């Protein structure tokens, strides 16, 4: 629309029964943006674009939705086909109600078509299928008339397999069929498309045959049987010379004769067909060769922009009818609350329900209009609105802000239209936020309005790359750039690794490379270098400190005897989730530690500190007998344990599951000789000595990875996992669907490029998600530089600037 009227879009939008909120989903290169361009052709990242289509009485009555009027407004989202952007298509699906499935006739139903339909049918969206690039089969594959029909049947059957498998058992009849008008065929590039329902109208104006019965006769095993004028339902042998079907002979035949004549330059035959099909010409189209006369005649003979929007208006649901069965799906609250019911009604006078999903940039750094869908009530520019956070719970204090909107705006083709207000059930953006909503959330008015579901998406950030600037002084520009990228792109994840490294996380290599390109040039504006992130390890023991560790103070008046213990993992897991907490009281925390974990009760009471940081998974035990001045050096001992458990003695990493049993202490009588300067160094060296005799080992982080993959591609999961030392844990199958779910332990060390390896091995059908689970102890010695665990230590030391070898137990130990 070329600036029809600012009020006119507002006025048409007021009607909530004549509006269609749909998103176009397809495979990566199946022509979805070209079809969308052809839909906006007659109207004079994914920003919503709106379409206006009139209608007449006969075809508006043939609509199974509560509606009144003759004009319709269509809300269109250009969803991305790439699996690396399979999160913003989920954002589109939440904000829309219909799905236009663009399908290739050549490639058929591809992997990403499989994925997007699974997303749409999971979100309870009715799909409508359009088969594009039909011109390619006509000019490249040279299908004559029946091969094209058979390809269409295979395409429709393939889509319905997806639909029948993944359609929830609340609608059932969401299957797609050309006969009902739910499948369209055309060439978006040339701007022509059709539906058999549209074609059934074209012949009715001349034959007078009924249109309701042409649906099941223009498709399938249905033959006109010419020379007899009897619509047979089977070949019958045609008394010899079996004949063609109605689809080929009535729908595809007029198309093919036009193609054959126009492409073969039958200048005497082109006007004959054109005058038969009541087409319109121009003042320069008569002098035209092939490949351009074909485009103009096809767009005029069968306009894609006309067939497609009528396709949306008939079958794609309106907001008022889908929220009926969808409200309980987006609202995690009960089904019996006024706010839940107001969603189903889609009444514009109840409490506000606006789900913000996107932050649309403003060509200004940091303004980021808040794109979303209004669900209940009417939003007004300048009204107090309660913003809710993704983790908001109404019971207690949470991410609730009491700000107001500056301006409600309409999205269009990269222009912003301010309106005073907007009814429920449409697409609206808000100005005055992105200082109050990080990624998503809802905007409400009620005090009992729980935020709706978190808009789960099928992908997750699995590609990890460390980032840092070549220029040291340019650090804050990068972190400013990182924070701006975290809010522009909804699926990118920025955080700090445990080795003090900036990590950018993406869905796949292509999406991550897009975001990293934004960092280098657009967001940060500073040139940075990208490396695999540094894996943070832990240091543990697997023995009992074969001989006692002995260390002397610098003054030699103090000696520490201790030993190391390989603390059980279950006790170690207990500490870090709060079961064994230092701030608990001794002799009670000891009882839980002793009775419920198999430890000795006496050791359980005699706790000095946890390491590192005072609450870590490492322990120091007072195994000493009666001794004079332990209590005055207790503070120094725990400080050294904090030092020793923060920087281990192998390559300087945190200790884990290490217990220090202090067998004996010999201290000088005078406090000035057993001060911190004498005990802190000697305990750390004794701990370092004790660690190095109890078979030191290093622990690597292990990801818990779960992958959803179809049956045909499950083999790639095991092949990559068994090559990357992955340990398969469990398998399962979803009810009715063929989707496998594989749970496995993939070590973080061998976890960079795993998703790229996995996608290639499974043909892109595998969807992995990873989260840190636990630490696994490597069996090989980390002091043997030629061992599998000793190469990590040697590599880490060089990167830190330390020496190549590890200081042996001979250091940190004094001979006595």
């Amino acid at each position: 629309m070329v600036a029809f009227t600012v009020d006119q879009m507002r006025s048409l939008m007021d009607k909530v029964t004549n509006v269609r909120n749909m998103s176009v989903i397809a495979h990566v290169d199946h022509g979805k943006s070209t079809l969308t361009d052809s839909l906006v052709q007659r109207a004079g990242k994914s920003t919503a674009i709106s379409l206006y289509s009139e209608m007449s009485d006969e075809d508006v009555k043939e609509i199974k939705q509560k509606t009144d009027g003759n004009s319709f407004l269509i809300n269109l989202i250009d969803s991305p086909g790439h699996v690396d952007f399979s999160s913003e298509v989920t954002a589109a699906l939440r904000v829309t109600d219909g799905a236009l499935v663009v399908v290739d006739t050549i490639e058929g139903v591809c992997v990403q078509t499989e994925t997007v339909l699974r997303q749409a049918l999971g979100e309870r969206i009715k799909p409508v299928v359009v088969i594009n690039k039909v011109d390619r089969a006509l000019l490249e594959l040279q299908v004559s008339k029946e091969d094209l029909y058979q390809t269409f049947a295979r395409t429709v059957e393939s889509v319905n397999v997806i639909v029948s498998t993944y359609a929830d058992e609340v609608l059932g009849d969401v299957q797609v069929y050309p006969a009902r008008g739910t499948v369209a065929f055309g060439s978006g590039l040339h701007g022509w498309a059709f539906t058999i329902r549209q074609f059934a109208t074209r012949y009715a104006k001349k034959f007078g045959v009924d249109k309701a019965k042409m649906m099941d006769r223009l498709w399938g095993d249905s033959f006109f049987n010419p020379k007899t004028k009897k619509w047979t339902n089977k070949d019958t042998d045609a008394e010899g010379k079996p004949l063609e079907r109605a689809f080929n002979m009535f729908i595809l035949d007029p198309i093919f004769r036009l193609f054959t004549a126009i492409m073969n330059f039958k200048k005497d035959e082109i006007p004959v067909l054109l005058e038969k099909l009541e087409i319109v010409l121009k003042g320069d189209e008569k002098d035209l060769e092939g490949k351009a006369l074909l485009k103009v005649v096809m767009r005029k003979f069968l306009p894609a922009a006309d067939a497609l929007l009528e396709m949306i208006v008939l079958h794609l649901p309106s907001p008022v009818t889908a929220q009926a069965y969808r409200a309980e799906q987006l609202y995690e609250g009960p089904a019996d609350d006024a706010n839940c019911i107001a969603i189903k009604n889609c009444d514009p006078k109840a409490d506000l329900m606006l789900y913000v999903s996107k932050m649309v940039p403003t060509s200004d750094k940091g303004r980021f209009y808040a794109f979303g869908r209004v669900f209940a009530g009417t939003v007004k520019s300048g009204q107090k609105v309660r913003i809710q956070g993704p983790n908001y719970v109404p019971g207690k204090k949470d991410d609730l802000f009491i700000k107001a909107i500056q301006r409600v705006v309409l999205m269009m083709g990269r222009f912003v239209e301010p309106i005073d207000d907007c009814p429920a059930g449409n697409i609206i953006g808000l100005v005055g936020i992105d200082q109050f909503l990080l990624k998503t959330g809802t905007l409400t008015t009620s005090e009992t309005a729980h935020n709706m579901k978190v808009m789960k998406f099928s992908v997750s950030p699995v590609v990890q790359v460390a980032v840092e600037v070549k220029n040291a002084n340019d650090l804050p520009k990068l972190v400013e750039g990182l924070k701006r990228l975290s809010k522009s792109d909804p699926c990118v994840l920025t955080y700090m690794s445990e080795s003090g490294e900036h990590i950018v996380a993406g869905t796949g290599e292509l999406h991550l490379e897009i975001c990293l390109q934004d960092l280098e040039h657009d967001h940060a504006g500073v040139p940075l270098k990208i490396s695999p992130p540094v894996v943070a390890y832990r240091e543990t023991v697997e023995s009992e400190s074969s001989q006692t560790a002995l260390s002397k103070s610098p003054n030699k008046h103090n000696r520490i005897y201790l030993k190391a213990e390989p603390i059980d993992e279950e006790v170690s897991l207990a500490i870090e989730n709060g079961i064994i907490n230092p701030r608990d009281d001794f002799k009670a925390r000891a009882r839980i530690m002793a009775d419920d974990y198999g430890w000795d009760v006496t050791d359980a009471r005699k706790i000095w500190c946890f390491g590192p940081d005072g609450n870590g998974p490492n322990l120091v035990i007072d195994q000493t007998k009666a001794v004079q001045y332990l209590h005055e050096i207790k503070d120094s001992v725990v400080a050294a344990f904090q030092w020793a458990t923060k920087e281990g003695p192998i390559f300087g990493e945190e200790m884990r599951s290490v217990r220090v049993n202090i067998l004996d202490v010999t201290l000088h009588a005078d406090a000035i000789h057993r001060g911190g300067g004498q005990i802190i160094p000697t305990m750390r060296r004794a701990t370092y000595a004790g660690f190095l005799l109890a078979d030191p080992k290093i622990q690597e982080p292990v990801f818990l990875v779960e992958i959803q993959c179809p049956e045909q591609a499950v083999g790639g999961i095991y092949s990559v996992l068994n090559k990357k030392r992955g340990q398969v844990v469990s398998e399962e199958q979803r009810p009715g669907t063929p989707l496998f779910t594989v749970k496995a332990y993939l070590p973080v060390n061998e976890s960079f490029g795993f998703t790229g390896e996995l996608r290639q091995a499974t043909g892109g059908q595998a969807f992995p998600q990873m989260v840190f689970d636990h630490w696994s102890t490597l069996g090989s010695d980390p002091l043997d530089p030629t061992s599998k665990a000793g190469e990590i230590v040697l590599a880490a030391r060089k990167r830190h600037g330390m020496k190549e070898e590890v200081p042996g137990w001979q250091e940190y130990y004094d001979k006595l």
Binding site: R154, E157, S158, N160, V161, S164, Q175, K234, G736
Partner: protein
């Protein structure tokens, strides 16, 4: 080998002189499980003996010394055949042998003896099997969450052998178009041969 070979001679000799009736059965395309089933049925009543066509002929030709009449057996000993020996009511013995017919599953490469069809039916198979139908070009719809063929398709034409794609779909739907079982070419008893009919 010869001692093993002569042992079969002894077994054949014993049967020939202890079972007045013997059934010459053509065992073409007959599986080994089917053979096991037939022997179980005929157990007690009768004993089935197979062998090498040349081996039995030499055995019979030699045995003619004691038992001349057996000459007439020889000319009909050709092709894949076996001998069911009995002293029982042959008609019942004949019925059991020729009624154990078991429908052999459709197999890729077998010449089709008629026009195999996939008729419009509710196959009952879950929708993840449409590829098999789509492979053969069979139009299908998903009615009641299952594959429903829309229209008659002739999956294999008469004469042309069952292709691998053809067979795979057929074995899913259990449309085995050829059945095999032990057929009888001759009946010998009371020192006389005659056809089963």
């Amino acid at each position: 080998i010869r001692e093993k070979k002569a042992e079969y001679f002894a077994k054949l000799r014993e049967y020939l002189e202890e079972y007045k009736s013997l059934f010459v059965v053509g065992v073409d395309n007959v599986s080994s499980q089917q053979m096991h089933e037939v022997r179980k049925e005929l157990r007690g009543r009768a004993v089935v003996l197979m062998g090498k066509n040349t081996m039995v002929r030499r055995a019979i030709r030699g045995f003619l010394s004691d038992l001349p009449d057996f000459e007439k057996l020889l000319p009909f000993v050709k092709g894949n055949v076996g001998f069911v020996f009995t002293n029982e009511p042959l008609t019942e013995i004949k019925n059991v042998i020729v009624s154990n017919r078991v429908a052999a599953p459709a197999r890729a490469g077998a010449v089709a003896p008629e026009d195999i069809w996939v008729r419009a039916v509710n196959t009952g198979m879950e929708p993840g099997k449409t590829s098999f139908f789509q492979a053969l070009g069979v139009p299908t719809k998903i009615a009641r969450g299952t594959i429903e063929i829309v229209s008659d398709v002739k999956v294999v034409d008469a004469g042309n052998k069952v292709g691998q794609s053809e067979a795979s779909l057929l074995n899913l739907l259990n449309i085995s178009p050829f059945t095999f079982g032990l057929t009888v070419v001759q009946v010998y008893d009371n020192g006389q041969v005659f056809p089963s009919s």
